[PDB]
Amino acid sequence: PQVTLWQRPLVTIKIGGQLKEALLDTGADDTVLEEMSLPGRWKPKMIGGIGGFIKVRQYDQILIEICGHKAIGTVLVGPTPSNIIGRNLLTQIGATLNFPQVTLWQRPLVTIKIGGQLKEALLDTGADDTVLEEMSLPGRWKPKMIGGIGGFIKVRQYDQILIEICGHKAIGTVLVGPTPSNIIGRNLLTQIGATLNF
């Protein structure tokens, strides 16, 4: 399966003898699922994301079946707004990110050039939007709130912004705000021709 990124990369999973839909999320170190019934022992754990932090119940050694592919690993359960399949499982279903062909054993970091400034940023199939750390950007903008794992953040919305991402130019909407990582979302990932493969 090759996915383009014009639509959210959703798959069907079977986990805990139940069926679910989840987002293939190159942006996430971990797999996180909305509250659900799992058999066994867990440990308390916190994770951060855009918006802040959530207490999750961590289960290890959980069998999960994603688009016909079996995998065993760690599944976090908690108040995530979306079911997220993280890199811990993407690497197990042989998933790659082509735009170069990037495997997902490490965070898919790239260099960008935006507003005459060099930054690193994360190729994130889980983000409908591009959102960056505080930086000096030219021009006019609008207030916006975006959602994430830990609630909401206030961001500044700049449109028709040029970004070069690993040598490919692209033009569109960049959000600036208190994001823990620089994030390249599907608005721009579609422009440099990114696909997901498993």
Catalytic residue IDs = 124
Distance CA 91, CA 103 (A): 7
The backbone region for 87, taken as left when phi is positive above 0, alpha when psi lies in -120 to 50, beta otherwise, is alpha
DSSP string, 1-70: -EEESSS--EEEEEETTEEEEEEE-TT-SSEEE-S----S--EEEEEEETTEEEEEEEEEEEEEEETTEE
- Closest C-alpha to 64, from 125, 18, 131: 18
Helix/strand/coil percent split, the chain, to 5? 5, 55, 40
Tokens 């990110």 -> residue = 97
Torsion sign (Cα): 155, 10, 3, 86: positive
Can you tell me whether residue 152 is helix, strand or coil?
strand
Distance CA 158, CA 193 (A): 22
